[PDB]
């Protein structure tokens, strides 16, 4: 009917621990640090990013730029049409990763702390590498309903399935912009698996590490993908009374299908 002409939307970039992609202290000189910072509620240019049509991400005329093409170098703010033309190129995948195309190295927040400088690290699809461009800052607070129409309920350090209650403590989850799934009681805790192995009962640990085992993606087929190891959320032997939520290869049975009910 036409060509899907695309816009350049001004946006903030929320990532690890809900902290925005921010230009440090507002100064825009070539080489200043792109840091992590609490998401401002105003029109300060040092947090507002135009997703330009040429796969470049600009805040106030200057480009989100990697210093180099090696794991470890930091991401700075630089004059677009002065620096290397592909040190400013980025893509934003549907799974959350924002990636430079020269080397697969991905925008990451190596620490979950404020004032932390952004870098580019080798892509392990981790919590410290998941990003989401939005102007909505707060995470997504919903309930997660799975097999047999029962709820996902984090108790203290255990995730299990228990029939849904309108306000029970606690089955209300916050889907963060870094791919983590956090019980709203303690926002410092993530849906975490200790591997990178198959069965691996999923637990609830602190998001401090921001590891590849705490980042997830709600896929189109109703599964919740680990984004690493290619494993989804599985109810072990389809038995809720076991209180065992596990990782397992995608098979598509009701023990792997989920729907977020807000």
């Amino acid at each position: 009917a036409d060509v899907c002409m695309d816009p350049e939307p001004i946006v903030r970039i929320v990532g690890r621990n809900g902290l925005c992609v921010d230009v440090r202290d507002g100064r825009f000189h070539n080489g200043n640090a792109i840091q992590l910072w609490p998401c401002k509620s105003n029109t300060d240019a040092n947090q507002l990013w135009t997703l330009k049509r040429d796969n470049t991400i600009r805040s106030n005329g200057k480009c989100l730029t990697t210093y180099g093409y090696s794991p470890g170098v930091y991401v700075m703010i630089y004059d677009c049409n002065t620096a290397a033309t592909d040190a400013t190129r980025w893509q934003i995948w549907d799974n959350g990763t924002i990636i430079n195309p020269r080397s697969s190295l991905v925008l990451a927040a190596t620490s979950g702390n404020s004032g932390t400088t952004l870098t580019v690290q080798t892509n392990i699809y981790a919590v410290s590498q998941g990003w989401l461009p939005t102007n909505n800052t707060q995470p997504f607070v919903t309930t997660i309903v799975g097999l047999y129409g029962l709820c996902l309920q984090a108790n203290s350090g255990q995730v299990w399935i228990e029939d849904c209650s309108s306000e029970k403590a606690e089955q209300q989850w916050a889907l963060y912009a870094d791919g983590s799934i956090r019980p709203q009681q303690n926002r410092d805790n993530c849906l975490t698996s200790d591997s990178n192995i198959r069965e691996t009962v999923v637990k609830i640990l602190s998001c401090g590490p921001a590891s590849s085992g705490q980042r997830w993606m709600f896929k189109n087929d109703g599964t919740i993908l680990n984004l690493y190891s290619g494993l989804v959320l599985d109810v072990r032997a389809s038995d809720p009374s076991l209180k065992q939520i596990i990782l397992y290869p995608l098979h598509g049975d009701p023990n792997q299908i989920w729907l977020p009910l807000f």
Partner: antibody
Amino acid sequence: EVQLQQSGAELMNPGASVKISCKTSGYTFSRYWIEWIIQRPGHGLEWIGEILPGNGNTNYNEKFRGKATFTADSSSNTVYMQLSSLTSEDSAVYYCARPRDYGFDQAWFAYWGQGTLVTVSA
Amino acid sequence: DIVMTQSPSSLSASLGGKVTITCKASQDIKKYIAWFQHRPGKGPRLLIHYTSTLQPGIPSRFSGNGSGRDYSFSISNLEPEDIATYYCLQYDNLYTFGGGTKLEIKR
């Protein structure tokens, strides 16, 4: 800084594969890219591709997409390129080089290797 | 996707005379270009690493500059050791060489 060294000359049967090596030393091996440049008579120089050791990422010239295959062994601090289905057009001197630093105003070519001659002949 | 057509294909020059080689990119390389001297029987050698900045140990008679897509390269006080093939390399989009220029000298 120090050095890169490659393998000696090679003769292959037309239609086979040969794996040139590039032994790196004197710098932190994992954090720097390794480049590859062909030089056949009259053709001057042409950029083949690059491989980053330590994380196995690659970037290929499209003319060598399918001809080249870069590999890096983290144990012995080396980098290998392999040319498949060698015709007589693949008979050339193959160089390996490095950038000077992490880029991007650095990461121009420095620290070349002495080159390796591949001769494809029956 | 960044082609670089170099000029001229080759040239001869009298001893001591200035020479000029030019490279032109399909798009802007943003002053990211180097010049290389391929002495016969020797490996490549870098002379100018940023568009004008000279590599150490290169004589003051080697010069180069440019803006955007057009680039120059000039050896001024030519000498019998300057016989080589010279190439232009950009490192903005990726590494792309020119066709090279072969320098011959007279006696």
